[PDB]
Design a protein around this nucleic acid. Structure first.
Ligand code: MG
Ligand code: MG
Ligand code: MG
Ligand code: MG
Ligand code: MG
Ligand code: MG
Ligand code: MG
Ligand code: MG
Ligand code: MG
Ligand code: MG
Ligand code: MG
Ligand code: MG
Ligand code: MG
Ligand code: MG
Ligand code: MG
Ligand code: MG
Ligand code: MG
Ligand code: MG
Ligand code: MG
Ligand code: MG
Ligand code: MG
Ligand code: MG
Ligand code: MG
Ligand code: MG
Ligand code: MG
Ligand code: MG
Ligand code: MG
Ligand code: MG
Ligand code: MG
Ligand code: MG
Ligand code: MG
Ligand code: MG
Ligand code: MG
Ligand code: MG
Ligand code: MG
Ligand code: MG
Ligand code: MG
Ligand code: MG
Ligand code: MG
Ligand code: MG
Ligand code: MG
Ligand code: MG
Ligand code: MG
Ligand code: MG
Ligand code: MG
Ligand code: MG
Ligand code: MG
Ligand code: MG
Ligand code: MG
Ligand code: MG
Ligand code: MG
Ligand code: MG
Ligand code: MG
Ligand code: MG
Ligand code: MG
Ligand code: MG
Ligand code: MG
Ligand code: MG
Ligand code: MG
Ligand code: MG
Ligand code: MG
Lengths: 177, 136, 48, 98, 48
RNA sequence: GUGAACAGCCUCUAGUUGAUAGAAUAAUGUAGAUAAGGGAAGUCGGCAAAAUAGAUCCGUAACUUCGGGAUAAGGAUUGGC
RNA sequence: GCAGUCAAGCGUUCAUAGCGACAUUGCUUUUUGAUUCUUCGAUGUCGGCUCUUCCUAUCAUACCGAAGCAGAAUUCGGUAA
RNA sequence: GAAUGUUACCGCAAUAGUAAUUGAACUUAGUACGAGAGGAACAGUUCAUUCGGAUAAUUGGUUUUUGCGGCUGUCUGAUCAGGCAUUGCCGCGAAGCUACCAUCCGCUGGAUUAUGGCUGAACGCCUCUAAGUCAGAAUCCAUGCUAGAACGCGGUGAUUUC
RNA sequence: UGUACAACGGGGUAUUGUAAGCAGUAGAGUAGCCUUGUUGUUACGAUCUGCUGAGAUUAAGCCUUUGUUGUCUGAUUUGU
């Protein structure tokens, strides 16, 4: 099956394809949330700890935290819930869902590095991706720099450069509150 | 089995000897099916011919529309009750016996099938597959 | 000794159970080494 | 190969073993042995039959060290800054004061 | 030893067991090993 | 005592504990039971067997000599405290 | 009841692919008669059930020769129980 | 099961018995043949019928395991624990037995028949036949399988002293 | 007279479905005594819960055993 691994310290991600049911077998009966040591899966992964976060089975149905169960069931889902986006106020839809217990019927696992290992995973530990946006609300700018209500914010707001051919521009947010 | 049965079929415990009445499980107008013969079956002094899942019997409609009563026609068995054992190791049985009336080619008279349907039947009779909801 | 059950994938092209697991009954017969203690030599005759 | 579980009792069902029952609503019930199969057919209720998983889960029998704490947490703390703004002038103006 | 070389395909097939049953045969065996059985039942009134 | 009861089943008083015995538990029997799925296809014929059953309440057709048919049929209920 | 010989005819033409009149030679002993030998100081009917074995005048299955056998289907025949 | 010195072990094999059966689907192939309509077969594959010989891992049936629990009626002052009701009744129930209701297994050489042929005379030609000979069937004989002659047999062990 | 055999006992494996006992602020509730309740008190109450997947049974044709106890020369017959 395919592994979907994220290093959320670097905001990196890359997928790994694991064949050999023996290496795959480590994840079986493990749920979402449960931690999984690494060496079992690959000799690269030695040291690493993985948190199981979700994934998809064949036919593509999502896992859903907390179902328990290692199969599919059909649930009434609501606003504010995994695996459903309501089209309309008060809309609820009965939809199939995959359980949160891993079996060989999954097309992909979703894993979330919690502890780095003895060696560096390629496009994961060695590359790093910057947050898209900066603090927009007044006090959030304060805390992302630790400033007290004395420093005045307008100079700490982030400014993003951008070229207009032979003119580079500078656009900052719009502080609020 | 036989005609329009593309495929072979592994044996399954015979469950419905001649005289058995099974639920009619389609929307043809028929409510039950009375088995009078099992196609493809063989001889033995005193043995009742008996059908199984996926078999084609000859039947009559004991209960149902009168246009369907009083005449013999082909039907396919789709659920059992007599448990039987697949090659994957399992003994399994349905809660009723049931079939769907069909032509010699194996095409279904009706257009839907109410109930689950055994895979071994689905696998054997394409039209039975089309009209199935849950298989096995 | 006795019997027990087995599980194995089937290899049999064209079978509807090609590449599918089957469960099969099996017997087990206890089989410690045998020990050789003699040799007997036979000859052919018109009486066998 | 998949070990299965008993709909009634929640015993593991290793291959070829107990029976499988497909009910009118195409709900599938698996039994490991005719004991569970009978109590089921008898409209008995697993949560009232004292030797079943389901009964035990409900009456909280011997779970003990599952309710015992664990050691699972992280230790991150790392910058990245904001995409488009020069992440080089985001640590020199990140000197704080309180 | 067989009296003929059988060329059956059925004979010839090379099996590879994936699982051998090992639960008790003195009743409805629920467990392969004492370990599995401990894992499932937890601690009993004897034991530790 | 249970219970409608001189029923069946258990008991007090009284009276018996008589019926060749021992050891095994092959076939075939006699007598007593059970069987998945089907359900009279068995048979001259449902022969044998199985199903039903008490009580309280509900609800009961053709037909009739108006008396019946009728426990018609068909349902629900029932312990202990 | 079963099988032949002759070959006038049938078969578009063509006796004999498949058939076959008038005649005529047989075989069989699950038909029915004819007889009256044995049994009337007893050899208990018909059918079915169960079960074995045998015959072949072969319905199917193996291998063949014919055809008015293009193919598919069929018909006739041989070795075959 | 007496007797062929005793007793034991391992074997031979005369004679007798004998067994496997049928169908479909895929593929060949929408091919050969046919104006068309239609429409095969051999090799290969997967299953099935009827039959047979076992076997009980699994599933199911059986229950005096009178094994555990439940229930009525009475009897032992109550309790505990029990007795009786031709096995009181009920649910579960190991073991054993057991079912195309369950699973597994059922061998390959030769010689022939019909028939088609080879060479080839009788009969200068011709002919599968007369001599000689090739190919050949659910047949036959062996292979294999069951018994093992209690008056068929072989190899081998040990063979008693008060 | 020894990796002996047996009877027990132990451990495993099975079957049932939670033993007796004791306790309880569980319980439709009920009695009795007053000091008539700012849980008054003493007991009773089908059933429930805890100790408790407990207790019971488990080779009579299951498996195993470092333990305990015992047993280990009676009879008849056979020769080329
Ligand atoms: Mg604002
Ligand atoms: Mg309907
Ligand atoms: Mg008959
Ligand atoms: Mg009517
Ligand atoms: Mg459709
Ligand atoms: Mg049962
Ligand atoms: Mg059972
Ligand atoms: Mg067993
Ligand atoms: Mg008297
Ligand atoms: Mg007498
Ligand atoms: Mg008597
Ligand atoms: Mg006696
Ligand atoms: Mg029955
Ligand atoms: Mg019925
Ligand atoms: Mg009849
Ligand atoms: Mg009827
Ligand atoms: Mg009849
Ligand atoms: Mg009559
Ligand atoms: Mg009649
Ligand atoms: Mg009667
Ligand atoms: Mg009954
Ligand atoms: Mg009436
Ligand atoms: Mg009440
Ligand atoms: Mg006749
Ligand atoms: Mg003439
Ligand atoms: Mg002609
Ligand atoms: Mg003419
Ligand atoms: Mg006479
Ligand atoms: Mg007479
Ligand atoms: Mg006489
Ligand atoms: Mg007489
Ligand atoms: Mg006589
Ligand atoms: Mg003949
Ligand atoms: Mg011929
Ligand atoms: Mg012509
Ligand atoms: Mg014969
Ligand atoms: Mg003969
Ligand atoms: Mg002797
Ligand atoms: Mg095609
Ligand atoms: Mg033409
Ligand atoms: Mg047969
Ligand atoms: Mg049994
Ligand atoms: Mg009892
Ligand atoms: Mg008490
Ligand atoms: Mg008495
Ligand atoms: Mg009596
Ligand atoms: Mg058989
Ligand atoms: Mg051979
Ligand atoms: Mg020539
Ligand atoms: Mg010749
Ligand atoms: Mg000759
Ligand atoms: Mg000649
Ligand atoms: Mg043969
Ligand atoms: Mg020979
Ligand atoms: Mg053989
Ligand atoms: Mg002898
Ligand atoms: Mg000898
Ligand atoms: Mg002793
Ligand atoms: Mg408990
Ligand atoms: Mg015995
Ligand atoms: Mg001890």
């Amino acid at each position: 099956m395919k592994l979907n691994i994220s290093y959320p310290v670097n905001g990196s991600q890359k997928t790994f394809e694991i064949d050999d049911e023996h290496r795959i077998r480590v994840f079986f009966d493990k749920r979402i949330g449960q931690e999984v040591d690494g060496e079992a899966v690959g000799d690269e992964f030695k040291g690493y700890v993985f948190k199981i976060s979700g994934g998809n089975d064949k036919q593509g149905f999502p896992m859903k935290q907390g179902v328990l169960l290692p199969t599919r069931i059909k649930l009434l889902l609501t606003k504010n819930v995994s695996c459903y986006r309501p089209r309309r106020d008060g809309e609820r839809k009965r939809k199939s869902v995959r359980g949160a217990i891993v079996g060989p019927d999954l097309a992909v696992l979703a894993l979330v590095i919690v502890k780095k290992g003895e060696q560096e995973l390629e496009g994961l530990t060695d590359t790093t991706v910057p947050k898209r946006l900066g603090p927009k609300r007044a006090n959030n700018i304060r805390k992302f720099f630790g400033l007290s209500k004395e420093d005045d914010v307008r100079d700490f707001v982030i400014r993003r450069e951008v070229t207009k051919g032979e003119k580079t521009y500078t656009k900052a947010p719009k502080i609020q509150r | 089995s036989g005609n329009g049965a593309q495929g072979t079929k592994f044996r399954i415990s015979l469950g419905l000897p001649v005289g058995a009445i099974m639920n009619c499980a389609d929307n043809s107008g028929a409510r039950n099916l009375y088995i009078i013969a099992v196609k493809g079956s063989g001889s033995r002094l005193n043995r009742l011919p008996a059908a199984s899942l996926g078999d084609m019997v000859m039947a009559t409609v004991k209960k149902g529309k009168p246009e369907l009563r009083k005449k013999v026609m082909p039907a396919i068995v789709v659920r059992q009750a007599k448990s039987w054992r697949r090659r994957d190791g399992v003994f399994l049985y349905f809660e009723d016996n049931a079939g769907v009336i069909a032509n010699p080619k194996g095409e279904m008279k009706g257009s839907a099938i109410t109930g689950p349907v055994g895979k071994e039947c689905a696998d054997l009779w394409p039209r039975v597959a089309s009209n199935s909801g849950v298989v096995v | 000794a006795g019997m027990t059950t087995i599980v194995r994938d089937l290899d049999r092209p064209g079978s509807k159970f090609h590449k599918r697991e089957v469960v099969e009954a099996v017997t087990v017969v206890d089989t410690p080494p045998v020990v050789v203690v003699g040799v007997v030599g036979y000859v052919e005759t018109p009486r066998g | 190969m998949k070990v299965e579980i008993d709909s009634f009792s929640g015993a593991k069902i290793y291959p070829g073993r107990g029976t499988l029952f497909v009910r009118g609503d195409s709900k599938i019930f698996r039994f490991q042995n005719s004991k569970s199969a009978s109590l089921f057919k008898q409209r008995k209720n697993p949560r009232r039959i004292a030797w079943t998983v389901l009964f035990r889960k409900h009456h909280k029998k011997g779970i003990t060290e599952e309710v015992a704490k664990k050691r699972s947490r992280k230790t991150v703390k790392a910058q990245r800054p904001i995409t488009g703004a020069s992440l080089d002038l985001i640590k020199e103006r990140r000197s704080l004061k309180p | 030893k067989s009296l003929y070389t059988n060329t059956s395909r059925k004979a010839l097939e090379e099996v590879s067991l994936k699982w051998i049953d090992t639960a008790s045969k003195f009743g409805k065996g629920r467990f392969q090993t004492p370990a599995e059985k401990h894992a499932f039942m937890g601690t009993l009134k004897k034991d530790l």
